[PDB]
Amino acid sequence: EPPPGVKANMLRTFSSIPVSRICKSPNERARLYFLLAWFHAIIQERLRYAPLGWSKKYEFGESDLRSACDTVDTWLDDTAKGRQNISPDKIPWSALKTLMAQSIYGGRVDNEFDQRLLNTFLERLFTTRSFDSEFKLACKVDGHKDIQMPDGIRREEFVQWVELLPDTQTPSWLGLPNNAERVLLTTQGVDMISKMLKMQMLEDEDAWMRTLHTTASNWLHLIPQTLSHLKRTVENIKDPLFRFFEREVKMGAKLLQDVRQDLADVVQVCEGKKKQTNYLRTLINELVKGILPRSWSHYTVPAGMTVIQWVSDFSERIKQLQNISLAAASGGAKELKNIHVCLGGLFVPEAYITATRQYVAQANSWSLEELCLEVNVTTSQGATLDACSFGVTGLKLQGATCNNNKLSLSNAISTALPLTQLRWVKQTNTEKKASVVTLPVYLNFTRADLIFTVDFEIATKEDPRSFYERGVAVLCTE
Amino acid sequence: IFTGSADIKHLLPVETQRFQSISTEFLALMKKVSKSPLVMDVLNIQGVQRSLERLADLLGKIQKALGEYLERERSSFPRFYFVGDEDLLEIIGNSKNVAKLQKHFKKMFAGVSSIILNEDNSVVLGISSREGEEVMFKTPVSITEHPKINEWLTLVEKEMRVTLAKLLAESVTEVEIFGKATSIDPNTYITWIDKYQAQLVVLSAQIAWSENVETALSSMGGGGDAAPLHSVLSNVEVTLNVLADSVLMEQPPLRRRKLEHLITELVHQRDVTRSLIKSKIDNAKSFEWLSQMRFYFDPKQTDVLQQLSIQMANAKFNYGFEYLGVQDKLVQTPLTDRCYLTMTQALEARLGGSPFGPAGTGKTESVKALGHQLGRFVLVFNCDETFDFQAMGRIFVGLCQVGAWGCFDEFNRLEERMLSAVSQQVQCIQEALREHSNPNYDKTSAPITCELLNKQVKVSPDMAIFITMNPGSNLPDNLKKLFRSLAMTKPDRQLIAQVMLYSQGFRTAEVLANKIVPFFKLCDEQLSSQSHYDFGLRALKSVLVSAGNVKRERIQKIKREKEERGEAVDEGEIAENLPEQEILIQSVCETMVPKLVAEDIPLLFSLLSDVFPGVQYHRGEMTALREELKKVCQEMYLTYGDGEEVGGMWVEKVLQLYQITQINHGLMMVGPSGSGKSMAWRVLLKALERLEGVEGVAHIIDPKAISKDHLYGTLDPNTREWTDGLFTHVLRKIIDSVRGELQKRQWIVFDGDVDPEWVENLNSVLDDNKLLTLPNGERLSLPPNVRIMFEVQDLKYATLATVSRCGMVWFSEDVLSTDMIFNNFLARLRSIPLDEAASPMLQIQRDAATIMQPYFTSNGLVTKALEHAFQLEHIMDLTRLRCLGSLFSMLHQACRNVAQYNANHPDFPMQIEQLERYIQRYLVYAILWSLSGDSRLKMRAELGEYIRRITTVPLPTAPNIPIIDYEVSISGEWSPWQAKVPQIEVETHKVAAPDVVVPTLDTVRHEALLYTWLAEHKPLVLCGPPGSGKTMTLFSALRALPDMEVVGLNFSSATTPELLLKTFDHYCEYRRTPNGVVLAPVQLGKWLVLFCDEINLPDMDKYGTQRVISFIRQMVEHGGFYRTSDQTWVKLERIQFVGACNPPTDPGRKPLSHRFLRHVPVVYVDYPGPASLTQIY
Amino acid sequence: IAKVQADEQFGIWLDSSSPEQTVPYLWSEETPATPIGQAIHRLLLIQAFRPDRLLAMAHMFVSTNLGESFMSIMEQPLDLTHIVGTEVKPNTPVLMCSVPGYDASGHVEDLAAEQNTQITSIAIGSAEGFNQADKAINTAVKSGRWVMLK
Ligand SMILES: Nc1ncnc2c1ncn2[C@@H]1O[C@H](COP(=O)(O)OP(=O)(O)OP(=O)(O)O)[C@@H](O)[C@H]1O
Ligand SMILES: Nc1ncnc2c1ncn2[C@@H]1O[C@H](COP(=O)(O)OP(=O)(O)O)[C@@H](O)[C@H]1O
């Protein structure tokens, strides 16, 4: 395996790239190659801290570095025309940045926010200021430090600076918050426990049915007994929120009955009342091994979700569904617009966002495309709602704190957002403000599924870029 | 090779002489061997081993010499490497007969399907494409002056390039003149578009836009004056509007394709100029402008072929001037622009491209589109189990020596050895290409060569290789350092919709496209999940095509009104005043509404109001078609409704079906069994015939009964003998039109089921290509008149491909009502005679129907009993149509019994009073035995007491005996069944014989029922626990029947229709009557009972279909089948079917489909019991 | 729970960089636990409180149970010279698997240079490379040379 670390990655890059190739005139080619090495090391190290660093593990291999080196060679040669030295303002910075962002490295990148992160890294590194003696490769390093650019102009000086890099590396070198290391370490520890458990289970093979009976009974008391349906009437068929809540209630009730019947059949098999059919024995094996049954899994869930966590989430979701069902029975129109629903609990929260959009459109006689989303995180308990302002609870702001609806970068892993109050307003053509920042709202901690994009306001002089580098995002559920 | 064509003798002298001598020797040896075919005798031939070795040596020399000759010819004309060995030999042999060359021009050139020569083929005047576009040369190529084919085909290619370059120069001059005249006049614009080919028109537009933007940026440099860029954008929008109007007005197909190409180009130009204005570009040197493809045309260049220079960022290409014909341009989204940037950077860096991503992202499409943008011959090599290595080296040499491109579609489809070898060859070629980029090599005189075919191939710098790969993967490691991978994702449906709406004539295409696509996503999300729903790109294409058709129809309608009046005509104004949103919403309704379940139509209207606020859709009923439908329904004994009446829903459904037929050639009729879809489309066909005057023909085909090979034909593995399948035979017949059948409406109704296997060859036919490709090579085009139609019950296993390609008409069960079925039964009873006031038995039928009318009503005894029966439990899944068919058959037997009574007492016929009593009693008897017939005695008693509670018929006065135990005699009075069971005395010789049947209440009852249903020739089916007297009761009934031959057929799990077909060919003869081929038993006068012992048992297909059950369904519904050895309808004359299946709850018993159970009455023969066993034994 | 509430110094440990080194006494036992018992109890405490230090606490547990230098050899660079000189049979191939994006050929070339052993570098991906590798194996299996297959 390759020795992890920014210093090791940059040493490998400089060893791979020929010394003559770096030495070739103009002199700025050495610093350009150093910038390429630093950028490649930074992204390849951020790959480890996924999904915080990169939403998915892209293959930022040596082919990308070779393409980047060829691009830099060609463009620098064309600009210099054989001159021994060229001004740092003459280098085609725009061409280099665009090519690295859309062709060399952005070709593999498909996520819009990963592309945004790549653009921020490129705009921060590849600039005229990189040739200033006070350029900071990374800021707030190791709690309090800055990685200054090497002032040398030759490959020897750059490699020496690479070698004298401190051993003590932190994710703040890459741009991530320092707690990304803690998240990675606890993920690795949980993985090690799972691997050990797999080993012990194989040794345990060389009773189980009674323990499975206890587990099935416990899950049976965990899951609520039933979920009542909604009442489809002519008045409320027009209501988009109410249609969405019928769909949610029906799907949840169907899954509830399926899982309850499966648990009852497992209990009967354990007691000896029933034999093991093909599906029954497959389900029993999954329950014993702790693997989420595919038949049970019908709504998107975090990868690797265990059966116990899944039934706990199921119980909470059906409690929410029962609450909204009671609200609908009391009244299917006003309560469904003034209900504070948990976006994590809903099976398809993007459908809830679409339904709120449709409700506002019907209320204001507006087209769907003419609606823009605004978020007002209010702290007052049971805050009153506007004509078009909805209410969503349970949103988790990961990597920042929201005070007075303003974002400040925080070292905490996540902070809860009470009553985010998604509101829908008429879309305008005003330009995007500098202080506003677009935060993706991912479904879960995996960040593989995206629901919508909010536009929070950075506070004080927080750098919007710093936000993108830190990978701030909102999560529907923890 | 030699004796096949007489020309190669002159082409290859000496070699022909050598082979002539060798053939003499070989034929002498083979004559010797024919004399003594023993292996030992053959071995003992004097010096036979030496003779064979000498023959092998000499033959090899000639074959090699021939290979050297063909290599020399291919090196003479480098494009020859794309045709095969025998194709090239044919080409060179038939040099004089140029009519034999036109089939290879498609292989040799990109878009030159054929060439145009002089009257006597002395000189070549130009070239032609597959689409008919013609490229007359500036200087004709003379075959007489250059007789050698490799000497005048080179001139043809060079003249093609030079003619295209000069035409491009003139076209660019004309476009510059257009630009100098500010506003573009549509007449002159259309004149120019007609004058120049599609490729050069698009090139001229791109060159003009590039020069305009360069001048605008140069003027605006060093200031904030955005007026030049704003003027460029305004001019582009004005040109787009002019093209929209022109494509809306009537055009020839070629000019329509040119307008669509120009619209696709101008939409991209508008988007790019908007991006530039938004980015506030100052000077032309900025990379936000340099990263866009720019076309520079220099009139000062001496070389015409090197006048056009396509640059984009670092890369700087030149147009290859290869005639590409009229090929559909790809909509250039920003994603495809980034893809172009990556591949152009790779090409400049001398690295072959390699896009990757999920299938359906247009990887090879984007590669081909870029290659055509640069004017290069792009050769797509498919890799899915059709690849080869023998010709691939030849094609590689051709690419290197002609400068063409090569795209490997799904390169991972190759096996390991094939992939390794092809990767080695590609690596050699790409290393040769990268040898061009070095500075040390003298680029002025650099003949870079590669090692191909164990030879030196001078690689032209223009060639490129694109290795498209599909993850699930990794690029080969040997060439991983030579290729730059690119990820491709789903394209912009918004931009595709903009381009298509603009090409349909919608001026406000931007807003409509930004509305319709989110509406389709809204439908796909909010609407319920059904198997027949398609809201994809093909559905959007169909909706927009329908919108264009509706807009053109409104244009023509207003034109006709204003022509009838004295007002002048201005189609421009007429188009301007039409509501585009209303047209689009009307088309969306006319397309989506037919396919929607009854619970989804209000949801669709709510979504449609959400996306298109303040827009309403009003369906315009077609009065002429409504009247024709009413006439056909009256003549077919079917109820017709005008909306909210009995039959209103069904009439609405058939009208929607007609609309779907008009919009799409290939369509489906999904819906639950017994919904009315076959009646709907047959009535529609008859009414369309009556109204339009064009006769309608229905080729009902069952696709599941006949295997895929027999359905689509199969070429023989030897001699390549092609056999025509059912579908291919029908298509060939309609194409030939021997009896003038191309002037008729032919509907290829694929009545059956859709599964992912039998529709694979049908996907291309249902596509816009409308072509049936065959492994033989014949390409069967779909005629415009023919419509492929499906009558599938459900699309549970249907593929998304067919679902998207076929227009859907959902036929819910509530469409056809029990009131409709009762009215149909009564109408057929009162009109259609049973024996054949036409006849006294017809008069009896009319009296019986008059008596039964109060019961066949909306809230009558039959309806209430049917609801209660549905509430009850049954052995098979109860269906309304099975119940009603059984009841109607029983009532037909009742009136037949009345006729028999009249015949028995001719002096005193059936009095009206006793007829009333008898029919009133037999109605209750038939209701009981049709609803509770397939149910246990408990549910039979429940239904009996329910009838007793809810009836007005006097019924038996029994204290406890169920009404099912009473038999209605000819006289209306009831009679118990227990009076018909005699205490017989069995002879000691037949104590337990396989024919003796002790008379029991169950036997006297089921035998009577079987007699009625077998006399009606219904496909009666018996159910019950194994051991119940199913076969015993059936054989006793057939013994009661005078002339009824029986053929027992025991079905197993694996009994394909082959067992039934062998039974047919054993017991029946394929007599050919004047009406048609008729299947009939060898014996005369006796009906054949194809008694199937275990009808549930046959195992379902991989997609839940029973093949033999579908076969029996076809032969009991349409009254025949198709002979696969002759492809002709084989009507069944005297074949009748009976089943004796076990209950579906028993293991291995697959439940029968409702489409089959609809025709077959089901009886539940249960175990005798204790008292019955005591009596019998 | 009671000990956590009563312990004032709990917060400093809980919010420390390396809590596993100084996990406080938070469990009750009748008789003083063995060192392995202390290690396992501190492993449970670390897993419950600071699961991000679970890897370090497992390292400390394994060091207590098997010796401190148990994993120390793994930190050292590969001693491929000794591992090839002894403990590997000649007919046993050396499957030097590398994670994608890495090459292990340099280590073998350096080892062959260090031991002054003739090495035959061959790329298996080549179709002719198949037969070349077969011939090289046939020759070296008796000549006593090393064969490289890539
Ligand atoms: N317009 C109509 N008026 C009255 N009865 C009708 C009408 N259309 C169909 N029927 C009745 O329905 C039956 C014929 O239509 P049916 O739906 O059964 O055909 P199909 O679509 O081929 O059936 P399946 O879907 O089971 O293959 C007959 O019982 C007929 O009397
Ligand atoms: N009334 C009866 N008279 C004679 N045999 C009877 C009678 N009722 C039942 N059986 C017996 O029932 C058995 C099964 O009858 P059969 O029709 O062959 O069953 P299945 O239809 O299940 O194959 C036979 O042995 C037959 O003799």
Ligand SMILES: [Mg+2]
């Ligand atoms: Mg039908």
